[PDB]
Amino acid sequence: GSSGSSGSGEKSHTCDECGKNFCYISALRIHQRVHMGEKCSGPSSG
Ligand SMILES: [Zn+2]
């Protein structure tokens, strides 16, 4: 019974969709638009 949630990445927001990098999260969101496709009724936010 011990918590083992380690987090190792980068100080910069990385797109889990492709693996890009964006200093400002705001930018990432704008880029994510390129991934938007598998949605017809916007089930989840993003
Ligand atoms: Zn991406």
From Swiss-Prot:
Entry function: May be involved in transcriptional regulation as a transcriptional repressor. The DEPDC1A-ZNF224 complex may play a critical role in bladder carcinogenesis by repressing the transcription of the A20 gene, leading to transport of NF-KB protein into the nucleus, resulting in suppression of apoptosis of bladder cancer cells.
Family: Belongs to the krueppel C2H2-type zinc-finger protein family.
Source superkingdom: Eukaryota
Organism, scientific name: Homo sapiens (Human)
Protein name per UniProt: Zinc finger protein 224
ZnF endpoints (C2H2-type): 13-35
Self-association and partners: Interacts with WT1. Interacts with DEPDC1A.
Tissue: Ubiquitous. Mainly expressed in fetal tissues.
Protein localization: Nucleus
